Design a protein around this nucleic acid. Structure first.
Ligand SMILES: Nc1ncnc2c1ncn2[C@@H]1O[C@H](COP(=O)(O)OP(=O)(O)OP(=O)(O)O)[C@@H](O)[C@H]1O
Ligand SMILES: Nc1ncnc2c1ncn2[C@@H]1O[C@H](COP(=O)(O)OP(=O)(O)O)[C@@H](O)[C@H]1O
Ligand SMILES: [Mg+2]
Lengths: 463, 463
DNA sequence: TTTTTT
């Protein structure tokens, strides 16, 4: 047969070009998988791999028309599709893949077996990926300044390290984290360090993903989150001001699912794979429209309690309760960070933290006791018990306290209930929470019959 | 071998075509990097560089089809991308790049190593970039008329020199500048001089960005801010009249970050690079919806106090208190400025000021003292200290001062608090400000117990 | 209004 078909067959035999389910062709060039929806990178591969072919086939690949013919043959012979990005414990670079389990770096065919379509965007360097380096001690000093290693801050520092370490994993995560602190506290420095550590796997979007409907019309903000591993949203408005849009809880529930529904402009694709940890940098406590048990299990908070002040205003910052330590700031730090001085030391520290927590299994846990707005419900869980058959026999005491056995179940009137809950809740500050909770569980037998099926745990105890 | 392939390889070896992360190709023609989507700049480059090749190669480049073949080979050879605009201390021109560190001018290949996409839009002239010039004395007279060299105007003068100089640097800035002055004081003269000095690096933008959300829908104003170095906001509406929109503080926070989130029309792009200094010219005191420590750290102000009046109204202007000096009004000055008469003389002054200030490090500092609104918040922080363990052991004396014990913490009743803070603030003007401060830190002990968690320094320090 | 569409 003709030599062009033989060249196409030999190229296909190396498995350097593949077709995905989304309809795009990926090519293995320069030790990386690359694709482009508007430029057919196939011809680049044809020109690049001309050296591996024998001598009599190299000369005919210098003409663009024969390259077009070979690309047409390859497109004809390529029929079926394959799946991509199935290994959550591999970190891809521009010249290889790093294994997070043991720490070796793989290049060439060894890295080809893990079909990763995303990368940091820069080459990995072994010389700078060391522990004993002049930059490392300085980075450790900076980090110990931001998060001191004290017995009081141990628990917060653990969440800090775990949340930062989770950015290397390519799996769905069921919790999003808030970075809370005052001004000049080090939150943006941490953001820029993470950006300079992970490169193109990092992205930041607007706040419209938390207050607006996601699936109405085109929405590039949701679409750009596909296959990313870290998403930052920062500088939320103060909700105390009038006209502020409160955070939608259903958006929070949707953002923790493995697939997110959204559509970019001029597109028909509506599914996006969610691999990104979500970090919200803020200065004020969040406010939600509706609070329920489903929302409280997807929220975590990390505190920042160190101030970096000019010498002129130091004496003022020492009189504030929002700070636990005041230190002079360095003016040249931001320029050093912008030049990627601490890229590989921070990456090495992130991998070292990855071994500590996520090797058995990757999991994030909520911290519902850090939000004041969640206080009302939490202690409600420790004060009331739903009515049951076991409470019927002891009615002798409950009728003494004012309970009524109505339809063979122990019951308490709303009017009888409200003062009883008023003795343990400050009616002035929790005025709205009490009327909120009473109305979603009222039970009315008749126009004049009112009752609620709950029993206090203190009354159930034997006196 | 293929002759056209050899021509393409030799062309590529000169590093005249580059591929960016944006998917665009940039070429080096006429001592400048140019790029655009629908133009065949590559073929222009092949035709232009024809003379650098041996004579057996120059003849073939006269046929358009062979040029298309060479372009195809070149496009197939370019696989990797490169960074652009990484030097903040360079001033790109149409025919070269000027280094601000030493002052001498590069051209040719020397200017190629700085991949600067933007340019001033005009041609540099060596002869006109001279100090001893008869235009220089006129420019110096105008500048000294706007900002006199008096002792009481020393510090302000320095600020006036710094901000303009910051227009040369290509880095990010974290402060906002207000050009506050009454009518006919020289603000637009400085704006026009700066525009004539820098060319297309200048941009003028309306007040929509200050008062409206930037992440909702498309926003063309953010799109063209990319890689600009000077942004002016002119004709700020008066806020005393009803219906005026208050300035958003979150917009101020978002305008000082290295990356600004915004989307141009008909596009999916969401990221931009912020390299511009923003100057707002107004005739009235600005007002902000919310005032916090974060906002008063990103604001600077410089004053204009010299008035230009026609001789008819001099009697009206010489007695006004808002002015300091009155001068003759020159009608022909407007004629000279838009003729680009002082294009290079002002540039020399800008470079001199850049050597005076920004050689060690580029930094802009805020001036929160000169704002009528911020003084209320500034003063309170210097008379109140939050209670802690240190102020506990003085338990006895503070009881005689009206302070009340609660939860083993010193507290001050609100009723005891209003008279004492009214000793420094009269309620007729700062009543709303006082109440706005109160609501933030208001804490409740009982249904009728009103108190604050602060202690006065004057009430604890011995007289 | 703007993606839409050309
Ligand atoms: N370890 C450190 N030592 C000295 N200075 C530091 C250190 N870490 C950070 N800084 C500096 O302190 C300042 C803190 O600014 P940064 O933007 O990080 O704070 P922030 O709390 O995130 O601010 P904001 O929320 O208001 O944007 C910066 O100038 C930063 O360079
Ligand atoms: N040094 C000067 N000597 C004389 N006239 C001046 C001088 N500087 C500015 N002017 C006059 O001021 C006018 C422009 O003022 P402008 O910058 O618009 O003030 P404002 O910005 O306060 O409105 C010009 O018509 C010019 O004639
Ligand atoms: Mg910050």
């Amino acid at each position: 047969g003709n030599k062009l078909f033989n060249i196409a067959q030999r190229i296909l035999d190396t498995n350097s070009v593949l077709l995905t389910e989304r309809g795009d062709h990926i090519v293995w060039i320069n030790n990386s998988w690359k694709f482009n929806s508007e430029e057919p990178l196939i011809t680049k591969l044809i020109l690049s791999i001309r050296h591996q072919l024998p001598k009599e086939y190299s000369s005919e690949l210098l003409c663009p028309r024969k390259r077009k013919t070979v690309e047409a043959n390859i497109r004809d012979m390529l029929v079926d599709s394959v799946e991509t990005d199935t290994y959550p414990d591999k970190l891809p670079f521009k010249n290889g893949v790093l294994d997070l389990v043991d720490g070796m770096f793989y290049s060439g065919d060894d890295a080809k077996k893990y079909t990763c379509t995303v990368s940091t965007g820069f080459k990995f360097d072994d010389t700078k990926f060391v522990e004993d380096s002049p930059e490392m001690e300085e980075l450790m000093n900076i980090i110990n300044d931001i998060q001191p290693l004290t017995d009081e801050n141990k628990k917060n520092r653990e969440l800090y390290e775990k949340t930062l370490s989770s950015c290397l994993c390519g799996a769905t995560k069921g919790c999003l984290t808030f970075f809370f602190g005052e001004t000049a506290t080090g939150k943006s420095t941490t953001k820029r360090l993470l950006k300079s550590a992970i490169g193109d796997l990092f992205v930041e979007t607007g706040q419209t993903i938390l207050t607006d409907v996601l699936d109405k019309g085109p929405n590039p903000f949701i679409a750009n989150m596909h296959l990313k591993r870290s998403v930052f949203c920062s500088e939320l408005p103060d909700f105390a001001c009038s006209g502020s849009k409160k955070i939608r809880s259903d958006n929070i529930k949707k953002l923790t699912e493995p697939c997110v529904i959204g559509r970019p402009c001029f597109s028909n694709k509506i599914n996006n794979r969610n691999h990104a940890t979500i970090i919200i940098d803020t200065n004020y406590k969040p406010v939600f429209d509706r609070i329920d048990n489903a929302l409280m299990r997807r929220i975590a908070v990390v505190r920042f309690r160190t101030h970096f002040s000019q010498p002129s205003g130091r004496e003022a910052a020492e009189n504030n309760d929002a700070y636990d330590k005041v230190k002079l700031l360095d003016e040249g730090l931001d320029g050093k960070i912008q030049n990627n001085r601490y890229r590989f030391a921070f990456l090495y520290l992130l991998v070292k933290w990855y071994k500590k927590y996520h090797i058995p299994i990757m999991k994030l846990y909520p911290t519902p006791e850090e939000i004041p707005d969640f206080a009302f419900y939490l202690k409600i869980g420790t004060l009331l018990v739903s009515s049951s058959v076991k409470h019927i026999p002891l009615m002798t005491d409950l009728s003494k306290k004012g309970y009524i056995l109505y339809d063979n179940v122990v019951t308490l009137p709303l009017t009888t209930f409200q003062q009883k809950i008023s003795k343990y809740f400050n009616s002035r500050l929790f005025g709205h929470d009490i009327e909120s909770f009473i109305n979603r569980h009222k039970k009315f037998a008749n126009v004049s019959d009112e009752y609620l099926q709950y029993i206090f745990i203190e009354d159930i105890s034997s006196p």
